[PDB]
From Swiss-Prot:
Organism: Rattus norvegicus (Rat)
The protein's assembly and partners: Monomer. Homodimer. Homooligomer; the self-association is mediated by InsP6-binding. Heterooligomer with ARRB2; the association is mediated by InsP6-binding. Interacts with ADRB2 (phosphorylated). Interacts with CHRM2 (phosphorylated). Interacts with LHCGR. Interacts with CYTH2 and CASR. Interacts with AP2B1 (dephosphorylated at 'Tyr-737'); phosphorylation of AP2B1 at 'Tyr-737' disrupts the interaction. Interacts with CCR2 and GRK2. Interacts with CRR5. Interacts with PTAFR (phosphorylated on serine residues). Interacts with CLTC and MAP2K3.
BP-aspect Gene Ontology terms: adenylate cyclase-modulating G protein-coupled receptor signaling pathway; endocytosis; follicle-stimulating hormone signaling pathway; G protein-coupled receptor internalization; G protein-coupled receptor signaling pathway; negative regulation of apoptotic process; negative regulation of ERK1 and ERK2 cascade; negative regulation of interleukin-6 production
Protein name: Beta-arrestin-1
SUPFAM superfamilies, per database record: E set domains
One term under GO cellular component: postsynaptic density
Gene: Arrb1
Family of the protein in this entry: Belongs to the arrestin family.
Length: 355
């Protein structure tokens, strides 16, 4: 049908409506945040209702929002006055919501700038609980007389939407191969060559690595280890670098001396196989089902890397275990993106599904 999400304040006087939880960041544009807020005039005797979208990097324990212990930096703020409206054309969905809700439904629309970072959440673990961080997008509606006075938290409604990063695939040639040649007490080297089928992968999509080994030595490769590793750099409040494997396959395959090897391995770097690992960047909260691995950060040409709170990157690693025991290895970069999203109105709680 036509799904619409809604959340109200504890008093039941202010309810926000949204057509989707996740808004897709295409490179050039991002989905508009078109919404409607239902007000109660008896509660708004003299006051107005504002809706503010805030993109903020946070640092510190997740369950705490207090001065001194929790750091936050606003990366983008936008304010609209939903009542009085004082009108930008409206969307089809907004017209339907006002048509159904009545005379006290008022619209609001945000246009997220493209260069802003996407929703990301780093879960550091039980040992270092204070190093948690991330950036979030919050839609907040509240009743006030202006944007300067202090507002009670339960007089307002907060909806943590996500911006997710999508990118189309490139029509150019296939990704280039990475090579390495190393000598292992040998007159001639061991040649390792790996490559990826695609450049841009999506969540839940497997990755095929093409491994090609030319062993011109007298040594024997005992094992072939293939893995996808996540790299995540914290750039705003406490500079840090994280290394975490999100997929692993130990192949017992053996490359003989003076022989040539070739094989295509496939691994599944899915969050469903990392529910116990920590120090890992996610695109949302570890509790929700719609949470996946953090998408690759799109670093634009000569762009401010610092105002993006966390930089996330992925690489496939291919390691050869030579018998003796040295190691020959190569890494392959790839981009992890969010999948393309592919009448009466039915309401539903905005709260994302747990477990
Ligand atoms: Ba009336
Ligand atoms: Ba190289
Ligand atoms: Ba497999």
């Amino acid at each position: 049908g036509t799904r619409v999400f809604k959340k109200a304040d504890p008093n039941g006087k202010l309810t926000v409506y949204l057509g989707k939880r996740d808004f897709v960041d295409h490179i050039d544009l991002v989905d508009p945040v078109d919404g409607v807020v239902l007000v109660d005039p008896e509660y708004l005797k003299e006051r107005r209702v504002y809706v503010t979208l805030t993109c903020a990097f946070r640092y510190g324990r997740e369950d705490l929002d207090v001065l001194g212990l929790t750091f936050r930096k606003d990366l983008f703020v936008a304010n609209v006055q939903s009542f009085p409206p004082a009108p930008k054309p409206l969307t089809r969905l907004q017209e339907r919501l006002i048509k159904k809700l009545g005379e006290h439904a008022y619209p609001f629309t945000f246009e997220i700038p493209p260069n802003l970072p996407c929703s990301v959440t780093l879960q550091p673990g039980p040992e270092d609980t204070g190093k948690a961080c991330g950036v979030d997008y919050e839609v907040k509606a509240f009743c006030a007389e202006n944007l300067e006075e202090k507002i009670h938290k339960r007089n307002s409604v907060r909806l943590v939407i996500r911006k997710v990063q999508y990118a189309p695939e490139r029509p150019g040639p296939q990704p280039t191969a990475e090579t390495t040649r190393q000598f292992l007490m040998s007159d001639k080297p061991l040649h390792l060559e790996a490559s990826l089928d695609k450049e841009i992968y999506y969540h839940g999509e497997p990755i095929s690595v093409n491994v090609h080994v030319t062993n011109n030595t007298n040594k024997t490769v005992k094992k072939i280890k293939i893995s996808v590793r996540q790299y995540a750099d914290i750039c705003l409040f406490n500079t840090a670098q994280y290394k975490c494997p999100v997929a692993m396959e130990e192949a017992d395959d053996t490359v003989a001396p003076s022989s040539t090897f070739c094989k295509v391995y496939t691994l599944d770097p899915f969050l469903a196989n990392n529910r116990e690992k920590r120090g890992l960047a996610l695109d949302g909260k570890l509790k929700h089902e719609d949470t996946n691995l953090a998408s690759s950060t799109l670093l634009r040409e000569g762009a401010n890397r610092e105002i993006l709170g966390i930089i996330v990157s992925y690489k496939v690693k291919v390691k050869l275990v030579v018998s003796r025991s040295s190691d020959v290895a190569v890494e392959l970069p790839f981009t992890l993106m969010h999948p393309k999203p592919k009448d009466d109105i039915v309401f539903e709680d905005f709260a994302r599904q747990r477990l």
